[PDB]
Amino acid sequence: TDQEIMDAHKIYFADLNFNPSTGNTYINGMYFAPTQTNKEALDYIQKYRVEATLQYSGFKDIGTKDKEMRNYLGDPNQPKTNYVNLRSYFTGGENIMTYKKLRIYAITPDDRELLVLSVD
Description:
The chain is mainly beta. It has 2 helices and 8 strands, in the order H-E-E-H-E-E-E-E-E-E.
C-alpha cells in the first residue's frame, strides 16, 4: 500500500560531501534504514525518480534510475539497503545542492510514483 511504502522511507540518512574551508555541501545519495518493520516495503521499490536543485542549473527533474543496494551508511559492518545514488542521475555534470529543494519518488514495479522524501 501507498502508506506502507511511504512509512518505509521515514528513517533516512543523506550521504553528503562538505568542504569546511568553503562551506559547499553536496548530496551524493540517500540511505533508507533497513528496519524489520519496513524491510519488505523497501525490497519492493526498485527505481527512484528525483527532482533536485543543481549547483549551476536550477531545480530540475534529473530522471529515474534503479536503486543501488549499499551497506547501510557505507559501513561494511551494516547490511545492504535501499540507496538512491544521486550522482548517476541526469545532472548535466553538476552537483546537487544540500538544503535546497529536493523531491524523491519511489517507483512501484507497476511504474507508479509516490513521494517519499521532500526538502524545500
